[PDB]
Amino acid sequence: TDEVLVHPFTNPPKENIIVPPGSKSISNRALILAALGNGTVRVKNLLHSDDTKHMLDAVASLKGAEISTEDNGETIVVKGNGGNLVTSGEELYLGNAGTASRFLTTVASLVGKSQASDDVILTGNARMQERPIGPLVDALRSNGSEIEYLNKQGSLPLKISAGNGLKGGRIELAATISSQYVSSILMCAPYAKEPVTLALVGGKPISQLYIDMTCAMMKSFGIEVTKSTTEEYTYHIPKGTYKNPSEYVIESDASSATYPLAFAAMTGTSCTIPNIGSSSLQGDAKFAVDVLKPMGCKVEQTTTSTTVTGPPRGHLKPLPHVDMEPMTDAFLTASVVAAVAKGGSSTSITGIANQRVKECNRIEAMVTELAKFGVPANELPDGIEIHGIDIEDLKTPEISKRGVSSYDDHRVAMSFSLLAGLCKEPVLILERTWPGWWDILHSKFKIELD
Ligand SMILES: O=C(O)C1=C[C@@H](OP(=O)(O)O)[C@@H](O)[C@H](O)C1
Numbered sequence: 001t002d003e004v005l006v007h008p009f010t011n012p013p014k015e016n017i018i019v020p021p022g023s024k025s026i027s028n029r030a031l032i033l034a035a036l037g038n039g040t041v042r043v044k045n046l047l048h049s050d051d052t053k054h055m056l057d058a059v060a061s062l063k064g065a066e067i068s069t070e071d072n073g074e075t076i077v078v079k080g081n082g083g084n085l086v087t088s089g090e091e092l093y094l095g096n097a098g099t100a101s102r103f104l105t106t107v108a109s110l111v112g113k114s115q116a117s118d119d120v121i122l123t124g125n126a127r128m129q130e131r132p133i134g135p136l137v138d139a140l141r142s143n144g145s146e147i148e149y150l151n152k153q154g155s156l157p158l159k160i161s162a163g164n165g166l167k168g169g170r171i172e173l174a175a176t177i178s179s180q181y182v183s184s185i186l187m188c189a190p191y192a193k194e195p196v197t198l199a200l201v202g203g204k205p206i207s208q209l210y211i212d213m214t215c216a217m218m219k220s221f222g223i224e225v226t227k228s229t230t231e232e233y234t235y236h237i238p239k240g241t242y243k244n245p246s247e248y249v250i251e252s253d254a255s256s257a258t259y260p261l262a263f264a265a266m267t268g269t270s271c272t273i274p275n276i277g278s279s280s281l282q283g284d285a286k287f288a289v290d291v292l293k294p295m296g297c298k299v300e301q302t303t304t305s306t307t308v309t310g311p312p313r314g315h316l317k318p319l320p321h322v323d324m325e326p327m328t329d330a331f332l333t334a335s336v337v338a339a340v341a342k343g344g345s346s347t348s349i350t351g352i353a354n355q356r357v358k359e360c361n362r363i364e365a366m367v368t369e370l371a372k373f374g375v376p377a378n379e380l381p382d383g384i385e386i387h388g389i390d391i392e393d394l395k396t397p398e399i400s401k402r403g404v405s406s407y408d409d410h411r412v413a414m415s416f417s418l419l420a421g422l423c424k425e426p427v428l429i430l431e432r433t434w435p436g437w438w439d440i441l442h443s444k445f446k447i448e449l450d
Contacts, residue, residue: 003432006417006429007449009266012447014270015269018271020253021253023047024433029187031046032104034248035059036107036187038083041078042246043076045250049097087117089114091123094124101133105147109188118163165192172201175205176203179211209283223237255284258284264309270308278301279304290322290326294317295318314390314391317341318343319338331352331384332366339373347385348383360409363384366384374394406429
């Protein structure tokens with residue numbers, strides 16, 4: 001963790017066009033779906049990260065899916081043959097890419113034998129080898145997979161016997177566990193022998209929006225999942241093969257999009273995200289229309305683009321109540337916008353209890369740091385209540401608590417960098433995804449730093 005001193009947004013540019021990096025969640029799914037699909041797909045706007053880099057090399061190794069890059073590595077070309085994969089004999093090294101290991105574990109259960117090997121080995125580093133993966137291994141074994149823990153019980157490394165495939169039919173999966181286990185099974189379900197009924201048991205899953213994103217992406221690749229008539233969390237997946245589209249563009253990250261949009265809202269300037277609109281797979285795409293618009297912003301949104309122009313500085317309106325369940329990651333951004341919407345009514349955000357168990361307690365972190373700016377705030381039973389003030393923010397002193405703590409949480413720091421820009425003197429962010437945001441502050445918004 002490092003330090004960054006954000007200078008006031010003294011005279012921002014009038015208009016600004018920002019294309020955020022691609023979504024991580026969408027990037028990771030697209031590579032699995034393309035590897036299993038039939039046809040050659042050019043994947044654009046992929047987010048390069050631990051998952052994708054390890055995923056890319058893992059798919060490269062398996063026989064039956066070919067990976068290459070074009071246009072200076074910005075285009076990933078995947079040619080699938082319809083999911084007829086065979087072992088290379090190479091151990092697939094996944095580092096500590098948690099999502100890749102969950103997705104690839106079920107892919108490996110589909111792989112056929114070769115003369116080099118009768119199995120697929122999935123490995124990773126020491127942190128990988130402490131990650132629990134039991135609930136997924138249990139469900140695949142229950143469906144005919146043969147999986148051996150090669151080191152510690154319940155984690156990678158895994159040896160998955162090839163040539164077995166998945167029986168299909170009913171697969172039961174506990175609902176308390178990561179949605180990434182559900183998603184991992186959904187994407188491989190069409191390749192089971194028998195059509196799959198994926199029934200979550202033991203309660204309601206928490207990250208339902210990410211299950212829905214997997215289903216919608218599956219539909220883009222030619223396979224429509226259907227929900228049960230009597231069970232909200234039972235999914236019926238046809239047997240089939242994905243049809244790879246000629247091109248698939250990874251949506252830019254709509255959560256990251258909220259920070260430049262909030263900048264425009266908060267400075268009385270204009271920001272356009274030219275490739276994120278109302279047809280987005282991501283709930284956070286609704287931030288502009290469901291948060292910034294009621295708060296006094298002039299907002300236009302087409303199916304694929306979003307433009308936000310804030311009201312004059314100091315003129316944001318409090319949003320008396322907003323349910324941010326469809327977009328919980330954007331509540332930190334909503335909170336700093338609300339901090340300068342003078343009331344009147346407070347801004348009350350509910351539906352974000354799940355946001356209390358992330359890197360830090362983000363609700364608690366937001367209340368405590370807001371106090372440092374002179375912004376009253378308090379927790380609600382289901383969220384947060386912000387008592388916005390005039391842009392008479394507390395003037396910042398040097399080397400005497402000018403530090404805003406980010407609690408090692410990426411989003412907390414980016415949110416408070418916006419509020420920092422509205423103060424009368426520079427503000428230092430302490431204990432500081434999207435490294436380019438700090439670059440974009442200086443290159444696009446032309447904000448001085450350090
Ligand atoms: O499938 C995905 O891409 C994601 C599902 C969620 O995981 P959990 O269901 O474990 O919360 C989310 O927290 C994570 O950031 C990404």
